[PDB]
Amino acid sequence: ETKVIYHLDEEETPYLVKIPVPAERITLGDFKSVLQRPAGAKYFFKSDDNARLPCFNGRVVSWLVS
Amino acid sequence: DSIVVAYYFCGPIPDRTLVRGRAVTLGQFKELLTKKGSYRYYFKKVSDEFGVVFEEVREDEAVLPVFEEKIIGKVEKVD
Numbered sequence: 001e002t003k004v005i006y007h008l009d010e011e012e013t014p015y016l017v018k019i020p021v022p023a024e025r026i027t028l029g030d031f032k033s034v035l036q037r038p039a040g041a042k043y044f045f046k047s048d049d050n051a052r053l054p055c056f057n058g059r060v061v062s063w064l065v066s
Numbered sequence: 067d068s069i070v071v072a073y074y075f076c077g078p079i080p081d082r083t084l085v086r087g088r089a090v091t092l093g094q095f096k097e098l099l100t101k102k103g104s105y106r107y108y109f110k111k112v113s114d115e116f117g118v119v120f121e122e123v124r125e126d127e128a129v130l131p132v133f134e135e136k137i138i139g140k141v142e143k144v145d
Contacts, residue, residue, distance in 0.1 A: 005119065015108055016119040036144055059116065 002026045002055060004034075006062040023058045027051070031062070041066055069132070071095065073139035082136070090137060093126030099141075110138040 002023045007014045021030045029049035046061035047054040054060070069090060072082045085094065096102055108120035111131035120140055123130065130137045 003115070013110060013118055013120055016111075016113070016115075016121040018122070038145060057116070 002053075002058055002060060004031065004053075004060040004062060006060075006064055008064050009066055023055050023060075026053045026055060026060060028053060031060075037064070070136040071139070072136055073141055076142040085137075090130045091126065092123045092128045092130055095130060095137070095139070096126070104144050105141050106144060108140045108142075109133075110140070 002019050002021060003016060004019055004026075005014050005016050017034055019026060019030050019034050021027070027049060028043060028051060031043070031053065032049065042065045044063045045054050053062070068084045068087050070082050071085045071090070072079065073095075083098070092107060096105065096107070099105065107123050109123055109131045110133045111119055111121045112133065113119050113121070118133070121131065130139070
C-alpha cells in the first residue's frame with residue numbers, strides 16, 4: 001500500500017489516498033483505477049500506465065490539471 | 067459530548083451540524099446522507115507525513131479526523 005499525495009488543480013490542501021499496491025508496483029494505471037477521474041487530466045511527479053511512479057520512502061507526490 | 071461538522075458536498079458549505087460524540091464515525095457521518103453508494107469521502111487532517119491533507123475515509127467504522135475543533139470534510143461524487 002502506497003501513500004499518494006496529489007494537488008488537484010490548485011486547491012489549497014492536497015489529498016491523501018492509499019493505493020493497495022505496494023510501492024514496488026505503483027503504476028499510473030493504479031492511480032487511475034483509484035481516482036476514476038473524468039478525462040482528460042494530466043499528471044506530474046516529484047523528481048504512461050505501464051510506467052511506475054517515483055516515490056521516496058513510500059510517498060508519491062503528484063499534481064493534476066483538468 | 068457533541069462536536070461540529072462542516073463538509074463540502076462537491077463544489078456548498080452546508081450548515082455546520084452538531085453530531086453526537088462517541089468518536090464520530092464515517093458511517094455516523096454518511097447516515098446523514100441518502101442516495102449514496104458512489105460517494106467518496108475525504109477529511110481535512112493534521113498530517114504532513116513525510117502540511118495538512120484530505121485523507122480519504124472509506125470504512126463505516128473509521129474514526130473521523132478532527133481539524134481545529136470540528137470535522138472539516140469533503141464528499142464528492144464519481145461518475
